Structure formats: structure tokens, C-alpha cells
Amino acid sequence: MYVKLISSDGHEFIVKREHALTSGTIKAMLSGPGQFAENETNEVNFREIPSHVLSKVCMYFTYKVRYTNSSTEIPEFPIAPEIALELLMAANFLDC
Amino acid sequence: WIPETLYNTAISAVVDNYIRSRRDIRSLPENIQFDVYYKLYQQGRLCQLGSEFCELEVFAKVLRALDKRHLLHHCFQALMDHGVKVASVLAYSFSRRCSYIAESDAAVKEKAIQVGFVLGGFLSDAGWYSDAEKVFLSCLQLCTLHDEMLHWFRAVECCVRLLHVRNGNCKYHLGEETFKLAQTYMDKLSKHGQQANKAALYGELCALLFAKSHYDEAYKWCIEAMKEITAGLPVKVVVDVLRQASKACVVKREFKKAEQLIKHAVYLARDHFGSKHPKYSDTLLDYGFYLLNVDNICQSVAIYQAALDIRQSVFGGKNIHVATAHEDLAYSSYVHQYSSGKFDNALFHAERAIGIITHILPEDHLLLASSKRVKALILEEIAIDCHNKETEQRLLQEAHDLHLSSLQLAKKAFGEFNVQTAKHYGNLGRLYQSMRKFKEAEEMHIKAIQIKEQLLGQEDYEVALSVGHLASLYNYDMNQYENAEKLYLRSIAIGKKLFGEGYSGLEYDYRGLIKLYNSIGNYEKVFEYHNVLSNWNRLRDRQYSVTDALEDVSTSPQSTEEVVQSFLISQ
Amino acid sequence: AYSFSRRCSYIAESDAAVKEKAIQVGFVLGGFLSDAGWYSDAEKVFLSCLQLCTLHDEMLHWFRAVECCVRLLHVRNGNCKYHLGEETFKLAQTYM
Amino acid sequence: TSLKPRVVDFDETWNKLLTTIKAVVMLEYVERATWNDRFSDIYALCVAYPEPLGERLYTETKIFLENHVRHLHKRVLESEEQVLVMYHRYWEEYSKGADYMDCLYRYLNTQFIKKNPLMEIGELALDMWRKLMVEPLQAILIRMLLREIKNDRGGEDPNQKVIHGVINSFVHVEQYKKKFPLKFYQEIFESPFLTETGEYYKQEASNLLQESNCSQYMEKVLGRLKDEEIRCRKYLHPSSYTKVIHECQQRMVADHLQFLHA
Amino acid sequence: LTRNKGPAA
Amino acid sequence: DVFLMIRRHKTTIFTDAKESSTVFELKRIVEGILKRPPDEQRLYKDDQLLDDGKTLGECGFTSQTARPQAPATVGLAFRADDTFEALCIEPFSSPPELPDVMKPQ
Structure with missing residues (x-):
């Protein structure tokens, strides 16, 4: 129920599996030979995405999962001006 | 949420x-670049988007x-409404890079042509034919230098498009020499042991000669175009050839033969492109042309309005395609509501077209x-139909000015002995x-009858x-009744021969x-013509039960080979 | 208005000095947009200034909040939003 | 590095990709780290500078799939009289490989194939199986498939999964044919099968009346139809539940309609 | 309505 | 409902918990993830240790500063031979510092 989203710098963002399957690309990575990791958590390697971008991606995962189908007003995801360019390419690549 | x-x-x-x-x-x-620029458009940052x-x-x-090209066709339109001359700037930039790249190898120049083909195709799709012609002229200049088979093939592929952008801009005099040059390249390419599919070129020539009111030559060239339709042709080319051949058949009084052509063209457009595509809008527009010229006006408005709604949603506002x-x-609503007098909607569409065209086209344009x-x-x-005689003398004076402008334009371009x-x-x-x-009305009508009988047969x-x-x-x-008798009889004969007994003008x-x-004394004939008119009205009321023209095509009526072969074997 | 409303949220959690600088910028911009007549586009700026004014309990932040509600009452009278104006006045009376 | 458009050489990247693609289509063990790196390789190819190598990668994947399915076609024709079992064994592996390669080519599907006559890589592999394995085996495979289901009607007990796996392989190919998913299946196998099961219940129907009387005729009708119902649950597609159970009535009950009036 | 309609666009 | 990042060196745990939940429940979560008993873990918030009996809201984890879109960092250490190392939360990679457009040349 937990997946270890290893970044390019070696950071290991252990996020819940339901959270990470928000993105289509991580769902595809965890389908097929990528789900053969028997050691509890499925380690997903992200040799292109840096730690400061993958951290914000994981925060988006736990934000969208929590704020899904909620009748209350939903705040926008806070994306820093200096990180928006790098997060944009990671949002396309991850299909999240 | x-x-x-x-x-x-x-x-x-x-x-x-x-x-x-x-x-x-x-x-x-x-x-991602296009999504960012579409966000610039959506945010209203048109000034930052124009500079990009x-x-x-x-x-x-x-x-x-x-x-997401249909999105771009809106954004690129908004800038051209914003005042940013994006089309002319892009055409000038492409011409400049072509001038700078003409002294280079054919491998790099071919890539500049392929960038030129997509850009010129976009500008001709968007309706900027005056600016798409510069791009295609630059591409033709690039293709002219090298004389190998690939360059000749690219040159004929840019001349089948240069003919299209010189027809939407009403430059048929240049279109003739463009077709001559395309024919020269086709002959040179055929002399080198290779054949080029001359369907798009002949379809564009059919469109040119129909727009020039040469319906005999237009019919001949549309027949020659439909002879060249194969299975490997792109859907765009097949649709264009079907559409232009349908128009030529309609104007050559072949309504039974144009029906299948235009219905298959509409089916192809709605199948491949979809219900919200500018090419589907073009097919709907010429389907409405066919329906309007077969006395099916009551649903022609339902087809132009469908065609307009597709064009006005994809091409935004002040576009020539919307115009x-x-x-x-406006002309169909004029005809459809000719017996009702509710021309407020027809006038609204008519003054909207001129409002668009005068903004984007010069005053000396056909x-x-x-x-x-x-x-x-x-x-x-x-x-x-109004009551105030001041209005009756102002509206008619404006109509006189408009008709004189149209006549002088058509006489300058087409000539004196043409049909337009x-x-x-x-x-x-x-x-x-x-x-x-x-x-003077008698003189004008005599001139019109003389010119139309000289060219368009006699019936x-x-x-x-x-x-x-x-x-x-x-x-x-x-009150020249003995002269009007023979002309009424001839009009009845033509209307019954062509459209049968359901023709709308048969009422008038x-x-x-x-x-x-x-007014002459043939009262028993007056009574027999009352009962003939009553029979005509009953027949028209019976003929009113026609389903909408967008349901006649249904799903998968025929295929391209069957329709083309049927038209070919039908003379 | 959208740029200011998005940019204020990223520094609403920052120190009080940058919050006061953003409040001054928002006052200037909202005053300009209210003078020009873009009341619907000045309501966003004044609302964002209000969320900047309602995170710290202090005298000057109460002053800034009541000024925000006075100016936000003006952009809701000019936009003919009278069913929000009474609520804004009640909130202003609460802060006062 | 970074997720930026960078100039890449398609040759070595495609070779590295092709190693794992072969390792996953025919279901070998490929390392999870390597599998996750192949997604980065796909992305780098799809957004390469200055031109996106999406069309080149798509054409090379199509060429590889054509070559692989042709190799499997020759290898399944090589095993004479074992065509059906070998075809099913390779079809299971190829279906799993096509699904996993659809997972691997998710960026090509979403950003190139849908953007630009083109089929998704997962549904291109099934199309190559249809028109390069099933279509060449349109005769040999259907002969063994129809002659063997008739054999077990007499009392033979063949392998269950090979018969159902091959029959279901006609529908599994047509996942992407959302317009008519059952069009291919009802023509490749069912319309030959309905005629074959009509013959088996017409040739034997006369033999059934030859040695049986009227009183026991009614009871033995339900005995044979139950067996066809069991085979319908077992061998046939779920969408063919009603067609075969209704065709046998027109070939056996209607054949002896006057006899059943009594 | 003494006349017919107009020819073409 | 409070959202945290347990930041044992390079690892980062994006778990969710309630304000009424205790610190020992959070240690049980880390046990369920890192397979380490709660006695082996020592949680640190802003270089301040968290008592086991204290609730999450007691230690300063409210649903206003640890929202899902910006969770609150919670340090953690593992016992090494009957000892406890200090918190070693390694920083994330520094983003490319976009220069100010109004900085003079």
C-alpha cells in the first residue's frame, strides 16, 4: 500500500500507493515488470526528476487524493515561481 | 469540485x-508550448501572445x-482581430528565411519547405489567402532551383495549393498561369518515368473555372478530376474533388448526379474530420449550395446555419470563412423567407458579412x-415592403450603389460577356x-437574357x-402583355423540365x-390557372414533408469507389 | 488581479514585512482598479489583501483589514453586488 | 539530467529500448530499475531536439512487432499437428507483452499517437497478431479448433485452457475495435462453428431417431442440450451464450418438429 | 411579390 | 486531519493522521513502513523532540500549517547500538534560482 518514489538525487519519497496511482506514468511503471518488487514497497526510480520537483509532485498526490470530489472550496496547489518550469515538465511526463 | x-x-x-x-x-x-500559449490566450494576454x-x-x-489545432485556429484568429498582423508577419518571416536559405543544400531546403507547407496550409485553412500565397510562392521558389524528381513533386504539391490560395483570394488570372506552371511540372515529371496523382490540381481548376463562370470547362475538368480519384488519396483531396465536382454538376443541371457526390462528400467529412471541423463546414456550405439550387431552400438554411456555427466556433469572429x-x-434566408418578408435575420447576416470583409479585404476585391x-x-x-417612401428611396438608393459596385467589380475582373x-x-x-x-429595367433585363442565352444554353x-x-x-x-405571354410560357417550360412541378418560382x-x-380576356384560362396554382400549392404542401438534410446521408451510405464509378459511367 | 491574487498566497505564510509590502501593493493596485472602474477585477485584489490581513492578530493588521473591508465595500457597490456588501459591512463592523 | 528536450541519438537509445522490449514482449525477466529507465528513454525519444522522434520510434516499434509476430508465425507453423497448443502458449505471452508494452509506451500513446490511421502500441501489437498470425492461420487453426471440439463431444477429454484460450483470442484482439468488437470473432470462428454444430446435430439427429422411440426422445433432448450448454460455459465466448443454444434448436428440434407434436 | 428571387449570392 | 513528511535522511514519508492521534500512533505508522519498532524511533519537530504521550495537536501540528498541499516536516532518528543519532534531514535539491528581472546589469 506504499510505494517508494526514488528521485534522481537518491531521495526516497515513500508515498501511499493509492496516492501515487493518481499519475498515469507511475501507474504504468507499477504495471508489468515494475510490480515485481517483493520487498514490501515498490521502488520507482525517477532518474530525471529532481528531489525538489518530485517532493512537490508527491505533495500534489496527497493533495488531489484528499481534495478529490469535495463539495467545499478547494485551494489551488501552491507552485513556487522558480519551480513551475521544472514542475511543468514533470507534470506532463507523469501525466498527473 | x-x-x-x-x-x-x-x-x-x-x-x-x-x-x-x-x-x-x-x-x-x-x-507544452502550445498549452502555455493557449493559457496566454485564455488569460486574455493577447499582447504577450502576439509577440510569440x-x-x-x-x-x-x-x-x-x-x-489541439482547432484551438490554435481560434487563437491565431483572435490576434488577427486584436490588430496583430500575425499572418503577414509570419509570411514575411518565412520569405526572409527562404531568401537566406536558397543558397544551401537541398536537404536543409526540403525541411524549410515542409515548415512552409504546414504554415501555408494553416494560413489557407484560416482564410488568409493573401498571406498564404506568399508562403507558397516562397516554397515554389525553393522547389524551382533543383530539378530532381523530389523537387518537382514538391513543386506540383505546392502548385496544387498555390491554386487554392489564388482562388479564395479571387485571383483567377494568376490562377490560370499557376495551373499552367503546375501542368508544366507535371509533364516534366511524367517525362522522367513517374506519374503524379492529378486529382487535387484538377479539382482546384474546376473550382477556378466554376468561380469564373465557365461551367462547361468546369464540368469537363471535374470529370477529369474524378477520373483520377484512387484509394490512396488523402481524405482532404477526395473531399475537395467530390465537393467541387458536386458544384460543377449542380451548375451544369445534373442534380440527380450531384446528390450522391455531395452526400458522400458530407459523409466523408463527418466521418474523418468530425462534426466540428472547418472542412466539414466547407462540405456543409457546398451541400447547402446544392440544396439551394435544387429548390430545397426550406432546409438549406438549416445547413448554412450548421455550416456557419462550425465556422464561427472554430474561426472566431472577423474571418473571411465566417464572412x-x-x-x-444571408442569401438562403433571403430565398427561404422571400414569401414571408422577415428579412431582419437575412439582413443581419448580410451586413455582418460586409462588416467582416471590408475590415480584412480591400475595397477592390471580388x-x-x-x-x-x-x-x-x-x-x-x-x-x-415598408411604408415610408423616404425609406423606399433611401434603401433602393443604397441597393443601387451596392449593385453598381458589384457590377463594376465583376466587369473589371470577369469581363462583360460572363455570367456573373x-x-x-x-x-x-x-x-x-x-x-x-x-x-432602363427593360434594357438591363434584355442584356441579362442576351448574355445568359449566349452562354447558358436556352433552357x-x-x-x-x-x-x-x-x-x-x-x-x-x-403592360406589354403579348410580349410577357411567351416569356411566362418559356419560364413554365424550363421550371417544369428542370425542377418538376414543385418549383418555388412557379408560384410567382x-x-x-x-x-x-x-387583363387580356382569356378568363377560362384564368380559371384553369387558378386550379393549376391550387394543385401546385397542394403539391408543395405534400413536398414539405422532407426530413433534415443532415439525416439523408445516414451512416456509411456508400464508399468512394462506388460513387466515383457511378458518376463516371453516368457520362 | 489574478497575478496579485496568486502571488499573495505564496507569501501569506511568510514574515510580516513582506506581508505588509504586499498589502501596500494590493492597496495601490486595488485603488487603481477601483478608480478605473474594474470593480469586479478590484474585488479580487482587495479579497486577497483581506486574506493577507486575517492571518496575524495585531493592531496594524486590524487597521489594514478594516481598510480592506471599507475599500471592498466600494468595489461591491460599484459592481452592484449588494447581497455581498451587507456581509462585508458586518465583517468590517466585527473587525472594528 | 532533466526532463528537457535534449538532442539524442536514436540508434543507441532505440537499441537499449529494444533489448527490454524483446525481454518483455515474450516475457523474460527484465530488471525493475531498467523497466523504469525505459520510460525515461521513451520520454527522451518523444520530446527529442530539434525534432521529436515519435514517428521514428513508432515506425521502429511497428517494424519490430511485425518481425516478432512473423517469427512466431513461422515457429508455430513449424510445429505440425501442435499448431493450436503452441499458438495458445505464444498468444498468452504475446498478450501479456502487448499489455506491458502499452504500459511502457504510455507517453507515445498519449502525446504522439493520439495527437497524430495511427494505432496505440498496445493495440498495434494485437493488430499485428491479427493480420500476421491469426490471418495466415485462418485455415489451419480453425480446422483443428473445429475438429477437436467435435471430438470431445463423443467423450474425449482434451486440455481445457488451450481450447478456450484460442477461442477467446479472437475477441481479445478486438479490444480497440469499439465499433464492432464481435465482428471479427463472429466471422473467424463462430460462423464456421454454427454450421459445424448444425451438421453435428443434423447428421446425428437421424441417427438419434434411428435407435430411439418417442417416449424417450423427449428426455434425451435435454441430455444433449445440457452438454452443449456445458461446452458453451467452457469453450465458447460469453457473448455466444444464446446463439449456439438457439441454433441447435433449429437444426434438431425443427428437424424433427412433426415427431415432437405426438 | 410581383417578381421572383435573386440569382445566386 | 494533519499531513506530515517524516524525513529520515533521504527518505520522506507522506503519511496522514488526525490531530487527536498520538505521536505513538505516528511511530506505529513508521513501524508499518520502515519495519522499525517505536522504541527505535525518535521524532523531532523543528529540532524539538516529541513526547510519546503528547497528541499531534499538542506538539504543534494543526490542520492550518500542515495542510496536504504543504505538509509539515517531522524529523526522525533510528537507534544505533543502544544510542540515538541526531536528526539528519538532508535538504532537497536547490531549485534553479530565477534571476530578478529588475536586477541591473
């Missing part, structure tokens, strides 16, 4: 610091997004003349009949309309004939 996508959130956050990332957006993947779409470095990476849809729907003539026709019937100037003379005759200038739709106009002038106003012809025989 559902959370906003991280893609859309990051797009919103990369637009906001736009100056801090203006040079970095151009290094994004080609499907005016660069061929940036616009080339935008033209390669084909799913063409307006001036076509495509403005057709819009002016439709509004002039609508102003005629509004003037004769002949029907302009017929419209002048109608207007002068409305203006109580009966002698054609257009000469029937002109004969009916002259005969109504003689009968109702000039029968009413004029009834008054004609009533």
Missing part, C-alpha cells in the same frame, strides 16, 4: 512569471500539435461584391423595376430567372400568368 490538474496548475504558474520564463517556454516539449506567435521559430512548434458563411446564409449583392437584394424587398455580370445586370433590372425606371435555371424577371416587368408594370410565374390572362 474536482482538483485542478498539476499540468494545468503548473501551466498557470509558468504563465504568471512569464518574463522570468519567456525564453524557457520555447525550450519546453512541443505539446509572430515568430516562425515559435509558430512552427505550435503548428505541429494536431489534436463567406454569413453571405451564403469577394466583397458577392456580399454587397446579397445585402442589396435584401434591401430591395425590405424597401418594397449577366446576373448582376438581371439584378439591376429587378432594382430598376422596383425604382419605377421601367425603360437553364439562370436564364429562366431572367426571363421571369423581364416578363414580370412587362406584365405587371409595362403562375400568379403573373393569371393576371396576364385576366
Whole structure:
């Protein structure tokens, strides 16, 4: 129920599996030979995405999962001006 | 509410610091750059978007997004309404890079042509034919230098498009030499042991000769185009050839043969392109043309309005394609509501077309003349249906100015002995009949009848309309009954031969004939024509039960090979 | 208005000095947009200034909040939003 | 590095990709780290500078799939009289490989194939199986498939999964044919099968009346129809539940309609 | 309605 | 409902918990993830240790500063031979510092 989203710098963002399957690309990575990791958590390697971008991606995962189908007003995801360019390419690549 | 996508959130956050990332957006993947620029358009930042779409470095990476191309056709339109001359700037930039690249190897020049082909195709799709012609001229200049087979193939592929952009801009005199040059390259390519599919070129020549009112030559070249349709042709080319051949068959009085052609063209357009595509809109527009010329006007408005709604949603506002849809729907609503007098909607569409065309096209353009003539026709019937004589003398004077402008444009371009100037003379005759200038109306109608009989046989739709106009002038106003009798009889003969007994103008012809025989003393003929008119009205009421024209095509009616072969074996 | 409303949220959690600088910028911009007549586009700026004014309990932040509610009452009278104006006045009376 | 459009050489990247693509289509063990790196390789190819190598990668994947399915076609024709079992064994592996390669080519599907006559890589592999394995085996495979289901009607007990796996392989190919998913299946196998099961219940129907009387005729009708119902649950597609159970009535009950009136 | 309609666009 | 990031060196745990939940429940979560008993873990918030009996809201984790879109960092250490190392939360990679457009040349 937990997946270890290893970044390019070696950071290991252990996020819940339901959270990470928000993105289509991580769902595809965890389908097929990528789900053969028997050691509890499925380690997903992200040799292109840096730690400061993958951290914000994981925060988006736990934000969208929590704020899904909620009748209350939903705040926008806070994306820093200096990180928006790098997060944009990671949002396309991850299909999240 | 559902959370906003991280893609859309990051797009919103990369637009906001736009100056801090203006040079970095151009290094994004080609499907993110267009999304960022579409967010610039959506946010209203048209001024920041114009400075980016005016660069061929940036616009080339935008033209390669084909799913979200209908979005771009809106954005690129908004800038051209914003005042940013994006089309002319892009054409000038492409011409400059072609001038700088002409002294280089053929491998790099071919890539500049392929960038040129997509850009020119976009500018001709968007309706900027005056600016797409510069791009295609640059591509032709690039292809002219090297004489290998690939360069000749690219040159004929750019001359089948240069002919299209010189037809939407009404430059048929240049279109003839463009087709001559394309034929020269085709002959040279055939002399080198290779054959090029000459379907698109012949279809464009059919469109040129039909627009030039050469319906015999247009029919011959559309037959020659349909002979060249194969299975490997692109759907765009097959649709264009089917559409132009349908128009040629309609204007050559082949309504039974044009029906299958245009229905299959509409089916192909709705199948491949979809229900909200500009090519589907073009097919709908010419389907409405076919339906309007087969006395099916009651649903023709339902087809132009469908065609206009597709064009007005994809091409935004002040576009020539929206203007063409307006001036076509204005004429259909003029005809569909001719017996009702509710030309407020028809006039609204007619003045909207001129409002678009005068903004984007010069005052000396043929495509403005057709819009002016439709509004002039609508102003005629509004003037004769109002009550104030000041309005009756102002609207008719405006119609006179519009018809004189249209006549001088058509005479400058087409000439004096053509069909468009002949029907302009017929419209002048109608207007002068409305203006109580009966002698000059008779002269104009005689000129129109002479020109149309010289060219369009003797039992054609257009000469029937002109004969009916002259005969109504003689009968109702000039009181030359013995002259109007033969013209009513000829009009009835033509209307019954072509459209059967359901023709809409048969009502006006029968009413004029009834008054004609009533004012001369043939009263038993007057009674028999009353019962003939009653039978006609009953038949038209029976014929009113026709389903909508967008359901006649159904799903998968035929295929391309069957329809083409049927047309070919049907002479 | 959208740029200011998005940019204020990223520093609403920052120190009080940058919050006061953003409040001054928002006052200037909202005053300009109210003078020009873009009341619907000045309501966003004044609302964002209000969220900047309602995170710290202090005298000057109460002053800024009541000024925000006075100016936000003006952009809701000019936009003919009278069913929000009474609520804004009640909130202003609460802060006063 | 970074997720930026960078100039890449398609040759070595495609070779590295092709190693794992072969390792996953025919279901070998490929390392999870390597599998996750192949997604980065796909992305780098799809957004490569200055031109996106999406069309080149798509054409090379199509060429590889054509070559692989042709290799499997020759290898399944080589095993004479074992065509059906070998075809099913390779079809299971190829279906799993096509699904996993659809997972691997998710960026090509979403950003190139849908953007630009083109089929998704997962549904291109099934199309190559249809028109390069099933279509060449349109005769040999259907002969063994129809002659063997008739054999077990007499009392034979063949392998269950090979018969159902091959029959279901006609529908599994047509996942992407959302317009008519059952069009191919009802023509490749069912319309030959309905005729074959009609013959088996017409040739034997006369033999059934030859040695049986009227009183026991009614009871033995339900005995044979139950067996066809069991085979319908077992061998046939779920969408063919009603067609075969209704065709046998027109070939056996209607054949002896006057006899059943009594 | 003494006349017919107009020829073409 | 409070959202945290347990930041044992390079690892980062994006778990969710309630304010009424105790610190020992959070240690049980880390046990369920890192397979380490709660006695082996020592949680640190802003270089301040968290008592086991204290609730999450007691230690300063409210639903206003640890929202899902910006969770609150919670340090953690593992016992090494009957000892406890200090918190070693390694920083994330520094983003490319976009220059100010109004900085003079």
C-alpha cells in the first residue's frame, strides 16, 4: 500500500500507493515488470526528476487524493515561481 | 469540485512569471508550448501572445500539435482581430528565411519547405489567402532551383495549393498561369518515368473555372478530376474533388448526379474530420449550395446555419470563412423567407458579412461584391415592403450603389460577356423595376437574357430567372402583355423540365400568368390557372414533408469507389 | 488581479514585512482598479489583501483589514453586488 | 539530467529500448530499475531536439512487432499437428507483452499517437497478431479448433485452457475495435462453428431417431442440450451464450418438429 | 411579390 | 486531519493522521513502513523532540500549517547500538534560482 518514489538525487519519497496511482506514468511503471518488487514497497526510480520537483509532485498526490470530489472550496496547489518550469515538465511526463 | 490538474496548475504558474520564463517556454516539449500559449490566450494576454506567435521559430512548434489545432485556429484568429498582423508577419518571416536559405543544400531546403507547407496550409485553412500565397510562392521558389524528381513533386504539391490560395483570394488570372506552371511540372515529371496523382490540381481548376463562370470547362475538368480519384488519396483531396465536382454538376443541371457526390462528400467529412471541423463546414456550405439550387431552400438554411456555427466556433469572429458563411446564409434566408418578408435575420447576416470583409479585404476585391449583392437584394424587398417612401428611396438608393459596385467589380475582373455580370445586370433590372425606371429595367433585363442565352444554353435555371424577371416587368408594370405571354410560357417550360412541378418560382410565374390572362380576356384560362396554382400549392404542401438534410446521408451510405464509378459511367 | 491574487498566497505564510509590502501593493493596485472602474477585477485584489490581513492578530493588521473591508465595500457597490456588501459591512463592523 | 528536450541519438537509445522490449514482449525477466529507465528513454525519444522522434520510434516499434509476430508465425507453423497448443502458449505471452508494452509506451500513446490511421502500441501489437498470425492461420487453426471440439463431444477429454484460450483470442484482439468488437470473432470462428454444430446435430439427429422411440426422445433432448450448454460455459465466448443454444434448436428440434407434436 | 428571387449570392 | 513528511535522511514519508492521534500512533505508522519498532524511533519537530504521550495537536501540528498541499516536516532518528543519532534531514535539491528581472546589469 506504499510505494517508494526514488528521485534522481537518491531521495526516497515513500508515498501511499493509492496516492501515487493518481499519475498515469507511475501507474504504468507499477504495471508489468515494475510490480515485481517483493520487498514490501515498490521502488520507482525517477532518474530525471529532481528531489525538489518530485517532493512537490508527491505533495500534489496527497493533495488531489484528499481534495478529490469535495463539495467545499478547494485551494489551488501552491507552485513556487522558480519551480513551475521544472514542475511543468514533470507534470506532463507523469501525466498527473 | 474536482482538483485542478498539476499540468494545468503548473501551466498557470509558468504563465504568471512569464518574463522570468519567456525564453524557457520555447525550450519546453512541443505539446507544452502550445498549452502555455493557449493559457496566454485564455488569460486574455493577447499582447504577450502576439509577440510569440509572430515568430516562425515559435509558430512552427505550435503548428505541429494536431489534436489541439482547432484551438490554435481560434487563437491565431483572435490576434488577427486584436490588430496583430500575425499572418503577414509570419509570411514575411518565412520569405526572409527562404531568401537566406536558397543558397544551401537541398536537404536543409526540403525541411524549410515542409515548415512552409504546414504554415501555408494553416494560413489557407484560416482564410488568409493573401498571406498564404506568399508562403507558397516562397516554397515554389525553393522547389524551382533543383530539378530532381523530389523537387518537382514538391513543386506540383505546392502548385496544387498555390491554386487554392489564388482562388479564395479571387485571383483567377494568376490562377490560370499557376495551373499552367503546375501542368508544366507535371509533364516534366511524367517525362522522367513517374506519374503524379492529378486529382487535387484538377479539382482546384474546376473550382477556378466554376468561380469564373465557365461551367462547361468546369464540368469537363471535374470529370477529369474524378477520373483520377484512387484509394490512396488523402481524405482532404477526395473531399475537395467530390465537393467541387458536386458544384460543377449542380451548375451544369445534373442534380440527380450531384446528390450522391455531395452526400458522400458530407459523409466523408463527418466521418474523418468530425462534426466540428472547418472542412466539414466547407462540405456543409457546398451541400447547402446544392440544396439551394435544387429548390430545397426550406432546409438549406438549416445547413448554412450548421455550416456557419462550425465556422464561427472554430474561426472566431472577423474571418473571411465566417464572412463567406454569413453571405451564403444571408442569401438562403433571403430565398427561404422571400414569401414571408422577415428579412431582419437575412439582413443581419448580410451586413455582418460586409462588416467582416471590408475590415480584412480591400475595397477592390471580388469577394466583397458577392456580399454587397446579397445585402442589396435584401434591401430591395425590405424597401418594397415598408411604408415610408423616404425609406423606399433611401434603401433602393443604397441597393443601387451596392449593385453598381458589384457590377463594376465583376466587369473589371470577369469581363462583360460572363455570367456573373449577366446576373448582376438581371439584378439591376429587378432594382430598376422596383425604382419605377421601367425603360432602363427593360434594357438591363434584355442584356441579362442576351448574355445568359449566349452562354447558358436556352433552357437553364439562370436564364429562366431572367426571363421571369423581364416578363414580370412587362406584365405587371409595362403592360406589354403579348410580349410577357411567351416569356411566362418559356419560364413554365424550363421550371417544369428542370425542377418538376414543385418549383418555388412557379408560384410567382403562375400568379403573373393569371393576371396576364385576366387583363387580356382569356378568363377560362384564368380559371384553369387558378386550379393549376391550387394543385401546385397542394403539391408543395405534400413536398414539405422532407426530413433534415443532415439525416439523408445516414451512416456509411456508400464508399468512394462506388460513387466515383457511378458518376463516371453516368457520362 | 489574478497575478496579485496568486502571488499573495505564496507569501501569506511568510514574515510580516513582506506581508505588509504586499498589502501596500494590493492597496495601490486595488485603488487603481477601483478608480478605473474594474470593480469586479478590484474585488479580487482587495479579497486577497483581506486574506493577507486575517492571518496575524495585531493592531496594524486590524487597521489594514478594516481598510480592506471599507475599500471592498466600494468595489461591491460599484459592481452592484449588494447581497455581498451587507456581509462585508458586518465583517468590517466585527473587525472594528 | 532533466526532463528537457535534449538532442539524442536514436540508434543507441532505440537499441537499449529494444533489448527490454524483446525481454518483455515474450516475457523474460527484465530488471525493475531498467523497466523504469525505459520510460525515461521513451520520454527522451518523444520530446527529442530539434525534432521529436515519435514517428521514428513508432515506425521502429511497428517494424519490430511485425518481425516478432512473423517469427512466431513461422515457429508455430513449424510445429505440425501442435499448431493450436503452441499458438495458445505464444498468444498468452504475446498478450501479456502487448499489455506491458502499452504500459511502457504510455507517453507515445498519449502525446504522439493520439495527437497524430495511427494505432496505440498496445493495440498495434494485437493488430499485428491479427493480420500476421491469426490471418495466415485462418485455415489451419480453425480446422483443428473445429475438429477437436467435435471430438470431445463423443467423450474425449482434451486440455481445457488451450481450447478456450484460442477461442477467446479472437475477441481479445478486438479490444480497440469499439465499433464492432464481435465482428471479427463472429466471422473467424463462430460462423464456421454454427454450421459445424448444425451438421453435428443434423447428421446425428437421424441417427438419434434411428435407435430411439418417442417416449424417450423427449428426455434425451435435454441430455444433449445440457452438454452443449456445458461446452458453451467452457469453450465458447460469453457473448455466444444464446446463439449456439438457439441454433441447435433449429437444426434438431425443427428437424424433427412433426415427431415432437405426438 | 410581383417578381421572383435573386440569382445566386 | 494533519499531513506530515517524516524525513529520515533521504527518505520522506507522506503519511496522514488526525490531530487527536498520538505521536505513538505516528511511530506505529513508521513501524508499518520502515519495519522499525517505536522504541527505535525518535521524532523531532523543528529540532524539538516529541513526547510519546503528547497528541499531534499538542506538539504543534494543526490542520492550518500542515495542510496536504504543504505538509509539515517531522524529523526522525533510528537507534544505533543502544544510542540515538541526531536528526539528519538532508535538504532537497536547490531549485534553479530565477534571476530578478529588475536586477541591473
